[PDB]
Amino acid sequence: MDVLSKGSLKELLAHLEKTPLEEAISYRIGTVPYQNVLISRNEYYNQLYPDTTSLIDGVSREGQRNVNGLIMSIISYVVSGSGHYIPNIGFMLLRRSILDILTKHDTGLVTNNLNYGIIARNLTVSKMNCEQRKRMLICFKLLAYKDGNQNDYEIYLNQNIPLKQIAPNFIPGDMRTVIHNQDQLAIVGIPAYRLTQSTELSIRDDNAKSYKLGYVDWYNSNSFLRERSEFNLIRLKDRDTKYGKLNGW
Amino acid sequence: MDVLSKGSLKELLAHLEKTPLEEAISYRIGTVPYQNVLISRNEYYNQLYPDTTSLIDGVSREGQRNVNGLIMSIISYVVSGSGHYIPNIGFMLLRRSILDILTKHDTGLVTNNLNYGIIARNLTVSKMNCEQRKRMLICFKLLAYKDGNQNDYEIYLNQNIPLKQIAPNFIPGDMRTVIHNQDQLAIVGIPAYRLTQSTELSIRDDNAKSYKLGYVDWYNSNSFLRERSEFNL
Amino acid sequence: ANRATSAFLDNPHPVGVNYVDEGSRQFVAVAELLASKLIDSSRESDESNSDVPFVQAYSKFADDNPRHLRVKTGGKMANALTNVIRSYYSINAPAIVPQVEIDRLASKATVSGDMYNSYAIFNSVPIVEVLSPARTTVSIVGSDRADVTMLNTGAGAANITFNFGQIAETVILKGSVPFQLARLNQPMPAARFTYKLRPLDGPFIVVLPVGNPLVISATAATRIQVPLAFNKALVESGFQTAMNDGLFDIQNVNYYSSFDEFIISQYHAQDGINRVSTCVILGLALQAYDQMRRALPVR
Amino acid sequence: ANRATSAFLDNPHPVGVNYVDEGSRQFVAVAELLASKLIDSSRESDESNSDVPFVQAYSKFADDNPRHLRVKTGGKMANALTNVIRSYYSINAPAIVPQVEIDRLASKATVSGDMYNSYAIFNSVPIVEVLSPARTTVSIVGSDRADVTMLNTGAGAANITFNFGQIAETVILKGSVPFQLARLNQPMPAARFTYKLRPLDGPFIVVLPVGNPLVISATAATRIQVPLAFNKALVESGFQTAMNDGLFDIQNVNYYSSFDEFIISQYHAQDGINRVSTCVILGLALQAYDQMRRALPV
Amino acid sequence: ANRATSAFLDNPHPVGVNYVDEGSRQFVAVAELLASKLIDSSRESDESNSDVPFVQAYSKFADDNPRHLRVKTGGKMANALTNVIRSYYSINAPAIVPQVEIDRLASKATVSGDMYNSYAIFNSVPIVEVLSPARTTVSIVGSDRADVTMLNTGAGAANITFNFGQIAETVILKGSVPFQLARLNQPMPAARFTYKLRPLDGPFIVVLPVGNPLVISATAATRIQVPLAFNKALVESGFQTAMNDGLFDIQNVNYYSSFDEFIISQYHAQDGINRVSTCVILGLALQAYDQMRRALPV
Amino acid sequence: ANRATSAFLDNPHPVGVNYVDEGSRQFVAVAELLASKLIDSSRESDESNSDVPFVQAYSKFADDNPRHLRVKTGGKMANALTNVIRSYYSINAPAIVPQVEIDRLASKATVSGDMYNSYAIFNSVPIVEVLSPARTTVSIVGSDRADVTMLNTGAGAANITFNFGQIAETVILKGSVPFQLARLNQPMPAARFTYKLRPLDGPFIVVLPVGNPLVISATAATRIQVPLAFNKALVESGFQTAMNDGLFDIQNVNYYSSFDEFIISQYHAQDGINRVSTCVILGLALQAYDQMRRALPVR
Amino acid sequence: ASWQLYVIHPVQGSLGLVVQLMGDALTYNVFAQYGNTSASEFGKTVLTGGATNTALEGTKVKFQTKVTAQQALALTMALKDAASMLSQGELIGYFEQYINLALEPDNLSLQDNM
Amino acid sequence: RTVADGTFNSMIMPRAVIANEREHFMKTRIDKIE
Structure with missing residues (x-):
């Protein structure tokens, strides 16, 4: 919910710096990812409604124990709000931030063998919307810069024409590029249209609307932080600053 | 609607005195009765609703040209509110009052051969409520006493025990019996407020419900519209 | 000699003879007018997220206020309209309204129940009979566009008689190859x-040469x-809706693909x-039916 | 044994899964509402002999006043409407909007993007399979009116099995000559x-006598x-416009004569x-496309 | 060939056609509501050591104060409720109320009288027909749980047809040993x-191997x-009570073990x-009969 | 030897392993409590001739105000409850909530997720196996009451071994004729x-004399x-409702006539x-489902 | 509703008669007994007196005529004129008696017209 | 079709051959002749 609310590149990377890896990993068993299932949608149909479960749903799924599953759990958390079930990763890796895993070699995780095409296909890039594809491409660029695979990232964009048009423009080592970026990455937000307490047909759409309706409740909740009215009560370390720089950028 | 509103024997007899036989006969061609049909009741069921047509429905039906048909048309008007299609009866007979047909010999009609059991079966007495049955028995007693068939009416009541319990307590030709009668014969009255604008499953129940709901509107507006045509006659 | 006829012209079942008086015609016209208001009010209610426009129209249509516990089916007006529709289709269907x-529901709105103000054009082609000699095969297919396939196997050219009904005004014939008529x-x-x-001019004769059909x-x-x-457009939609709901499921009746064929x-x-006069009144009733069901949906 | 099937029922390509939420559904509804006013503004212009009704309708639709220099295109709403139509047809089409x-365009007018208020009747005839024995020829042709021509050259009468599926409600069969089913x-x-x-009743058997077809x-x-x-009427016209305008030219997709067949x-x-739900939303989008493009040809 | 049918499905007698209108439906609903208050008031009277709560409930139900030297019968409401129950069962009942x-008794409380606000699940199993070939014996026992015992005496396996009607929603079949259907x-x-x-999915064929039943x-x-x-629970108790009191003792009627079978x-x-509409109103009246008679035995 | 077992004991399909934590247990208890308010409010609306009590309870259950022309199904709460029920039944059913x-709906009402406060009695008769000699026949029918029919065709008396398992507390055996066990x-x-x-006493031996069964x-x-x-009573009614609506139609699952058998x-x-822990939560969920659908019916 | 249809095939003759009575409306058609194909039992109509529907469905009673086709036609023509002034029982009773018993109608005026 | 009277329907009604003396006399005579 909090990760889906971020609407700018600066906010997204700032959230990932303060968020540990354990938030990406889920400890609920879930179900196997790719299955043709029948779900109940009584608002629309009397018969059961066919659908296919996927990894970018908002509900936890079972994940492979390899490094591929860990990266695929991080991206699903960013684009869908929930991760997958990969237990016994370890204290050392789980305490690191999401940005450290994606960008830093000191974590101890080796990810240079990853194939962006296979990861995108397993994440069902075809079913993703524009904001979801932009968020995943941000994760790919950070991984490419960590492994020195910038050339491979560019070629993968050349093969996929729709991905090249929406590819965010920022150098993963320079903070000046992040501040200038004006891409809108928000998935949930205050809706200008009429939003009703109604169900959706597919699993992805229904789960997304739950976060959208939950965010509205979160926005008016006491947990939400109102910068306009309570800026002085925020701690100085985590207070918003114009000259905000990620470490090493 | 006027005939169904009467709730006492003396009101009902008074209405029949002023009502010509024309009002008890319909000019609409209608449909043949005793037919198994499927009707649409979408308030309750998606499928068609089985039912059977009858003479005592509120809708006009084709009638026979015999005397039996004319008596059945009179009774149907009393119990259901509508008559039957019997064409070319005659101007002189149609001008006579309903009570004249039932209780007077000057009309020129012969009703001695009528079988009360057959007439009741043709009118589906098994499907009639208590108020409808009492109205039908009033018409039988009037016809029986005109023909000198008082004994036959009593014997017919002995055979049908349930009809004997609700038999009207009046002797035709005696004014004292009519004055002191305490029967309730109102099929249609000012509705209890609990009544709603909803359909009923059966043909008979829905048509009776239609008369009940439209009685309030008819009560307020019938006098002026009747007078607008009655004057300068 | 062989005889071929259009499938939809065979044995038209008798239509109802009830609810065709002046008062009944007014009831059908009132139902069409009030159904049009109902379908428009539902659009306004959906746009404005308010039930006020729909409650006003439904109360006028059904003489009752919508209730959450009950089910909105159109009320007594809907019950009469559906049952009168069945009466028009067949003489076997009863008259139970x-x-x-009928008089009460016709007083809701003031309209003139005139069914002859205007005209409409219907495109069903009637082929009453096609007569062919012994050695010729003739097949008639279609109602909106009738394709007549003819093949001659005999030694000499055959004369084939085409009889179109006296009712139709204009018939246009086009052949795959040029022919003489x-x-x-x-x-x-x-x-x-x-x-x-x-x-109306008379039966027509077509000369079939031996060879290709x-x-x-x-x-x-x-x-x-x-x-x-x-x-x-609305009448055709109502006709198919009535068929799917089972309104025309009566004994010893014929079934048609469209209102034009009927x-x-x-x-x-x-x-x-x-x-035809009864069918036209049934057409207006079906127009009222279609607008009423689309306004009040049942899954 | 030979099997015959309808040509238009073969291999339906997967439809898109984007732009089918509540926010996008109201966008299509707003486009349909505002395109209707664009067409109706032309009639109002004739009555007043002024172009100010059309200017008002175009400004709401396109967020910009029309100019005599350039051809009227419809602005951002037209670009968004064209792209969502492509995405609905095929899963391979990109979701670029x-x-x-979509959020901003859906706020122009007040609508509810509910696609289950009413019903429509579609007239395509589904014949999943016609099973025929040997020495018989069966040909199925047509979608709105399916003509099945059957000829048997065998010694005796043959039985033909008809399978109309389970989705259609009513099927009426009319024969050139009387037959048994x-x-x-x-x-x-x-x-x-x-x-x-x-x-839903089940497979149907037709006796095919030897002789004339x-x-x-x-x-x-x-x-x-x-x-x-x-x-x-407007959805069908929009389907032909989109096909001619090259909005359906994507790789590995099937093409249909009408929205009825699709x-x-x-x-x-x-x-x-x-x-079905996605195709219904595409139909409403095509209804808006037909009205918008007829008012502003390009 | 042999045919086996359930005992309770044979020859349903005609039901009454009276007291099924809106006014009469409200009276049955009024009786049920007032009968429930009689039971609750008696419990309250016993706990509070005061007869005041019972006196109010009896006065509302019976229009008269309870008396020590007069038998507590429930008044005219009890007589009307008893008579309508007789009428519902058979068309030959007098129906003299x-x-x-009826109208005055429906004014004692305000209730809708709607008989379609909810649903109930009925467990009776309807085996309309079991068709068995020669050399096979089939027996059907029970209504709530139907046990079908089949013996194959002939040389080979036999096919047995089961018909469950077109009304029941679902049917579960369990066998003593695994079987094919x-x-x-x-x-x-x-x-x-x-x-x-x-x-609704047609008749079902069961393969019966030779050997043990x-x-x-x-x-x-x-x-x-x-x-x-x-x-x-209350309807079932009332059905048994009505039979023992003789309310269903009319000529040319059929008797059932439970309201489920009826x-x-x-x-x-x-x-x-x-x-089925008349039977539901009868069930509600029996629910009022059970509560009223338990509170006021006669 | 011949072995006979109860039909309902054979091959129990695995139950779901999701939505069994404290947060999900609270959601099921909240749904059951709110569904009970929904059914009582509908009774109050009937007695008061006002829709206010029902609209009041539907808003808490569905987080939405009822509007005419829109079918009342229970809102998002009904969607979650129906799909969670499917997951409890089978492990092949997806987890899509x-x-x-779950957390938002569990906060609607204050209630404990405790599922071990009380006890209930279940009447299904477990007959794990019945072992019989060669010349005897044994048949087992029924679940609530199990009738075991034994016939001996051999020369002498035979011994039949009865195994009732280890879970049931007491078993009462009644015979058509006196017998030795x-x-x-x-x-x-x-x-x-x-x-x-x-x-728990162990396998039981029954002497079956030669003669009548x-x-x-x-x-x-x-x-x-x-x-x-x-x-x-409420759980059993919900079980049949869930079966009729088809929520239990999942691949490779076993079907039971009652929740007692399941x-x-x-x-x-x-x-x-x-x-058995997962089944208890399913029973409470079915109780909520039964009360929800009876308040909001569909024809 | 009472409707009745009579099909008379005289063995001693060359013509047949079809008589239909729907209520009090009597119609007849004289048909040839020769030239019939296997499809229909009736030849071409030679004399017409209305429209007769032979496809009516109901119980069929077989009888043998005791009068010639000319005698049956003579009574049918007379019965048509007196259809309005006679009851259905009289219309039937006179026709059945003449066809089946060769019994002339008791009504003297009707007898003269025949 | 005009309205139907009851004249035809009374003719085809079954008769009491035993109770009626004339009907019994006639069938005894035919049985004897046969």
Whole structure:
């Protein structure tokens, strides 16, 4: 919910710096990812409604124990709000931030063998919307810069024409590029249209609307932080600053 | 609607005195009765609703040209509110009052051969409520006493025990019996407020419900519209 | 000799003879007018997220206020309209709506129940009979466009008689190959692709040469008097809706693909002029039915 | 044994899964509402002999006043409407329109993007399979009216099995000559011209006598839930406009003569109830495309 | 060939056609509501050591104060409730209650009288027909749980046809030993203990191997629309009470073990959907009869 | 030897392993409590002739105000409850309800997620196996009351071994005729009509004399821990409703006639102590489902 | 509703008669007994007196005529004129008696017209 | 079709051949002759 609310590149990377890896990993068993299932949608149909479960749903799924599953759990958390079930990763890796895993070699995780095409296909890039594809491409660029695979990232964009048009423009080592970026990455937000307490047909759409309706409740909740009215009560370390720089950028 | 509103024997007899036989006969061609049909009741069921047509429905039906048909048309008007299609009866007979047909010999009609059991079966007495049955028995007693068939009416009541319990307590030709009668014969009255604008499953129940709901509107507006045509006659 | 006829013209079942008086015609016109208000109010209610426009229209239509516990089906007005529709379709369907209810529902709105203000055009092509010699095969297929496939195997050319009903105004014939057609006891013209015919002139004769088959495509236009509110698009939709809901499931009745086939078939039967008037009233009733069901949906 | 099937029911391509939420549904509804006013503004312009009704309608639709220099295109709404139409047709088409742009355009007018208010009747005739024995020829042709021509050259009468699926509600069969039809394990009635059938009843057997060919004409009626603003005449015109304008030219997609054929083909595919909702939204989008492009040709 | 049918499905007698209108439906609902308050007031009187709560409840129900030297019978409401129960069962019942009396009793409380606000599940299993070939014996026992015992004496395996009607929603079949069952014109599956069936899916064929008898236990569930105040436990008690009191003792009627069998049997009769509405009102009246008679025994 | 077993005990399919934590248990209890308010409000609306009590309770249940022309189904709460029910039944059923939705709905009302406050009695009779000699026939029918029919065709008396499992508390055996039953390696007692048995005592031997068949009727009672809000009548009604609506139609699952059969079958399978916990939550969920649909019906 | 249809095939004759009575409306058609194809039992109509529907469905009673086709036609023509002034029982009773018993109608005026 | 009277329907009604003396006399005579 909090990760889906971020609407700018600066906010997204700032959230990932303060968020540990354990938030990406889920400890609920879930179900196997790719299955043709029948779900109940009584608002629309009397018969059961066919659908296919996927990894970018908002509900936890079972994940492979390899490094591929860990990266695929991080991206699903960013684009869908929930991760997958990969237990016994370890204290050392789980305490690191999401940005450290994606960008830093000191974590101890080796990810240079990853194939962006296979990861995108397993994440069902075809079913993703524009904001979801932009968020995943941000994760790919950070991984490419960590492994020195910038050339491979560019070629993968050349093969996929729709991905090249929406590819965010920022150098993963320079903070000046992040501040200038004006891409809108928000998935949930205050809706200008009429939003009703109604169900959706597919699993992805229904789960997304739950976060959208939950965010509205979160926005008016006491947990939400109102910068306009309570800026002085925020701690100085985590207070918003114009000259905000990620470490090493 | 006027005939169904009467709730006492003396009101009902008074209405029949002023009502010509024309009002008890319909000019609409209608449909043949005793037919198994499927009707649409979408308030309750998606499928068609089985039912059977009858003479005592509120809708006009084709009638026979015999005397039996004319008596059945009179009774149907009393119990259901509508008559039957019997064409070319005659101007002189149609001008006579309903009570004249039932209780007077000057009309020129012969009703001695009528079988009360057959007439009741043709009118589906098994499907009639208590108020409808009492109205039908009033018409039988009037016809029986005109023909000198008082004994036959009593014997017919002995055979049908349930009809004997609700038999009207009046002797035709005696004014004292009519004055002191305490029967309730109102099929249609000012509705209890609990009544709603909803359909009923059966043909008979829905048509009776239609008369009940439209009685309030008819009560307020019938006098002026009747007078607008009655004057300068 | 062989005889071929259109499938939809065969044995038109008798139509109802009830609810055709002036008062009943007013009831159908009022139902169409009030159903149009109902379908418009539902659009306004959806746009404004308010039930005020729909409650006002439903109360006018059904004489009752919508309730959450109950089910909105149209009320007594809906019950009468559906049952009168069945009565029009067949004489076997009963008449179960009392005249008091018909008079009450006709007073809701003030309209003139005139079913002859305007005209409408129907495109069903009537082929009453096609007569062919022994050695020829003739097949008739279609109602909106009739394709007549004819093949001659005999030694000599065959004369084939085409009889179109006297009702239709204009018939246009187009062949896959040029052919000769002429009226009875009239000279044969040169072979041409297209003929325009008036069926009232008389039976037509087509000369079939031996060899490749000839296919004739027929289209027709007939004008039938209808009320001004008549809408063929809405009437056709209501006809299919009534069939799917089982309103026309009556014993010993014939079934048709469209209202155009129904009205043309009943016109071509004996006492067709009397039958068409009832069908037109049924067309307006079906128009009211379609708008009412779309406004009040049942899954 | 030979098997014959309808040509338009073969291999329905997967439809898109984007732009089918509440926010996008109201965008299509707003476009349909505002495109209707664009057409109606032309009639109002004639009455007043002024272009100010059209300017008002165009400004609301395009967020900019029309200019005599350039051709009227419709602005951002037209670009968004064109792209969502492409995405609906095929899964391979990109979803390039951002959510924020859909968010802003859906706020122009007040509507509810509910696509299950009403119903529409679609007339495509589904014939999944016609099973015929040897020495018989069966040809199925047509979608709105399916003509099945059957000829048997064998010694005796043959039995032909007809399978109309399970989705269609009513199928009417009319023969050139009277024929016999009955369900599986049922007695065969007298020859009759017209049969009314329900596809859920089961497979149907037709006696094919030896001799002249027998042709059966089939008409079908299917009810699909659609929004109240649905107009089949405008949806069908929009389908032809989009096909001619090259909005459906994507790799590995199937093409159909009408929206009637398109919606029924996806309905009869495996897990076809998922595709029906998306195709309905595409129909409303095509209704807006037809009105917008007729007012502003390009 | 032999035919076996359930005992309770045979010859449903005609039901009454009186006291089924809106005014009479409210009276039955009024009686149920006031009868429930009689039971509750008696419990309150016992706990509070005061007869004041019972006096109010009896006065409302019976229009008269309780008296020590007069038998507590429930007044005119009890007589009217008893008489309508007799009328509902058979068309030959007298049906002598006046309309003025029914209307005045429906004014004692305000209730809708709607008999379609809810639903109830009925467990009676309807085996309309079991068709068995020669050299096989089939016996059907029970209504709530139907046990079908089949013996194959002949040389080879026999096919047995099961017909469950078109009204029941679902039917579960369980066997003593694994058995094969399939629909008409369908391949037989591997033998298994339990089958779940939809009765509308045609007759079912059971393969009966030669040897030890095979016993099939059948359970079915049917949903019938009932008012919200419907309570199956109280309806069942009232049905047994009414039979013992002689309310159902009329000429030319059929008797059933439970109200479950009564309602299902009338449903399966020709044009049985007419009777099901009257049977529900009878069930509600029996629910009022049970509570009233338990509070005021006679 | 021949082996016979109860039909409902055979092959219990695995139950779901999702939505069994404290947060999900609170959501089911909240749904049951709110569904009970929904059914009582509808009764109050009938008695008061006002829709205010029902609209008041529907808003809490569905988080939305009822609007005319829109079908009342229960809102997002109904969607979560129906899909969670499917997951409890089978492990093949998908888990599609997000954790954010479960937490939000669980906060609507204050209630405990405790599922072990009270107990209930279940009457399914577990007959794990009946072992018989060669010349005898044994048939077992019924679940609530199990009738075992035994016929001996051999020369002498035969011994039939009865295994009732280890879970059931008491088993009462009634015979059509007096019969002898004793434990393993125990002298046979005099013939008696009835026997009260403890299933933990061990396998039981029945002497079957040569002659007329002997029928033994078995009744069993077992104790399972359930929440205080558990109502057996409501749970059973919901189980049949869920079956009719098709929520239990999943691949490779077993179907039971009653919830009593379902819970006993899962208890007797391996790791049945863990399975029975999930079944209890399903029973409470079915109780909420039964009350929700009876308040909001569909024709 | 009472309707009745009579099909008379005289063995001693060359013509047949079809008589239909729907209520009090009597119609007849004289048909040839020769030239019939196997499809229909009636030849071409030689004399017409209205429209007769032979496809009516109901119980069929077989009888043998005791009068010639000319005698049956003579009574049918007379019965048509007196259809309005006679009851249905009289219309039937006179026709059945003449066809089946060769019994002349008791009504003297009707007898003269025949 | 005009309205139907009851004249035809009374003719085809069954008769009491035993109770009626004239009907019994006639069938005894025919049985004797045969």
